[PDB]
Amino acid sequence: SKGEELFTGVVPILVELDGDVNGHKFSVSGEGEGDATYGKLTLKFICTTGKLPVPWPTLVTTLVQCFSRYPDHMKQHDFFKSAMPEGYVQERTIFFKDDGNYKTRAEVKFEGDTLVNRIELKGIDFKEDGNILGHKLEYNYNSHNVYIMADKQKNGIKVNFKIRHNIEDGSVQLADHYQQNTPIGDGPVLLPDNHYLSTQSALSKDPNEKRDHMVLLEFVTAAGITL
Amino acid sequence: HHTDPEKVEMYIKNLQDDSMRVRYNAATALGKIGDERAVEPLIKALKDEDGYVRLEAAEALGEIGDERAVEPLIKALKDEDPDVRSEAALALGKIGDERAVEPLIKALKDEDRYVRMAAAWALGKIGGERVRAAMEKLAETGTGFARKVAVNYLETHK
Incomplete structure (x- = not known):
């Protein structure tokens, strides 16, 4: 693939989000760099609009899967890279167990030589003493598997997974993610057999930054196919 | 491949910890680690009093990929x-x-x-x-x- 050649070294990254959750308007923006050679992602995202109405973790998933470390044998299955630099469109719908739900639309593409993600979020039905609006969530993430599957009918992929958000003094708030991606340009893209991705994410906080922020350290690495 | 027996023990033990977040983490861990010694304990975790713990133990057994489970x-x-x-x-x-x-x-x-x-x-x-x-x-x-x-x-x- 021609897309994969772009990600051979470290590539700078940029993310912009406009959200609305049960009325509470807000916007987030982030800056960083990603080495798909290790599947590593390292970034910092900040609320431009002062305070964030939701807990940071919720947004992680919505706030790039082109930096996923696809092994040599699976290189035929990285739809995300293949779609570049023209880019792709990531549409999600995130049902929170016993709580509300998001709808998102992202535009992931290359600007010059920086990877850029533009998202547009809409939350509804969220309970006010819920975990989400009640900010009852721990500041960390878990390892999850992101289950990928091609969409012949359209021309992209149906992705699905179930995020496990830890509660401060409680168990787990779930999140069924129903995702679907589609290419921006008209170029030819790889459509993969059914596999998945293995994520490892870390949340930290900068002491010097005074704004509402998050420090992310990811490591998406693909698995499934065997040869 | 190679599996760090120190952690393998720890996590299989931790699978019967009082705290659920502990035994939840032990599931995920043992899945990634992929050791045969964790399969049996994970099927017994499959009947765990807690649901979220049952849940991981499941995918954990998926990751390990053993036909026993x-x-x-x-x-x-x-x-x-x-x-x-x-x-x-x-x-x-x-x-x-x-x-x-x-x-x-x-x-x-x-x-x-x-x-x-x-x-x-x-x-x-x-x-x-x-x-x-x-x-x-x-x-x-x-x-x-x-x-x-x-x-x-x-x-x-x-």
């Missing part, structure tokens, strides 16, 4: 909790055993959507002729979500 997983598809029975589906598609083809096709009809979606992948993953077989029959005997899946496989796969 196929049956217990098939039984875990019938779990009360849907989230647990979803991850059990996913797990069974990972292992790739044909013995899960029926119980998965049965789950395409499950009440919860995620559990229907999970199975869809899982079957798609397993594939081959015994899947292609039950899919062609489902293009007629099926209806609704399940039917939509069957045609989509016979579209994609040969």
Whole structure:
């Protein structure tokens, strides 16, 4: 693939989000760099609009899967890279167990030589003493598997997974993610057999930054196919 | 490959910790680690008092990919909790055993959507002729979500 050649070294990254959750308007923006050679992602995202109405973790998933470390044998299955630099469109719908739900639309593409993600979020039905609006969530993430599957009918992929958000003094708030991606340009893209991705994410906080922020350290690495 | 026996012990032990977040973490850990010694303990974690813990233990057994857990997983598809029975589906598609083809096709009809979606992948993953077989029959005997899946496989796969 021609897309994969772009990600051979470290590539700078940029993310912009406009959200609305049960009325509470807000916007987030982030800056960083990603080495798909290790599947590593390292970034910092900040609320431009002062305070964030939701807990940071919720947004992680919505706030790039082109930096996923696809092994040599699976290189035929990285739809995300293949779609570049023209880019792709990531549409999600995130049902929170016993709580509300998001709808998102992202535009992931290359600007010059920086990877850029533009998202547009809409939350509804969220309970006010819920975990989400009640900010009852721990500041960390878990390892999850992101289950990928091609969409012949359209021309992209149906992705699905179930995020496990830890509660401060409680168990787990779930999140069924129903995702679907589609290419921006008209170029030819790889459509993969059914596999998945293995994520490892870390949340930290900068002491010097005074704004509402998050420090992310990811490591998406693909698995499934065997040869 | 190589498995750090210090951690393997720790986590299999931790699987019977008082705190659930502990035994939840021990599941995820042992899945990634992929050691045969964790399979038995994880099937017994499959009956855990806590649901979220049952849940990981499932995908954990999927990651480890041992054919021993196929049956217990098939039984875990019938779990009360849907989230647990979803991850059990996913797990069974990972292992790739044909013995899960029926119980998965049965789950395409499950009440919860995620559990229907999970199975869809899982079957798609397993594939081959015994899947292609039950899919062609489902293009007629099926209806609704399940039917939509069957045609989509016979579209994609040969």
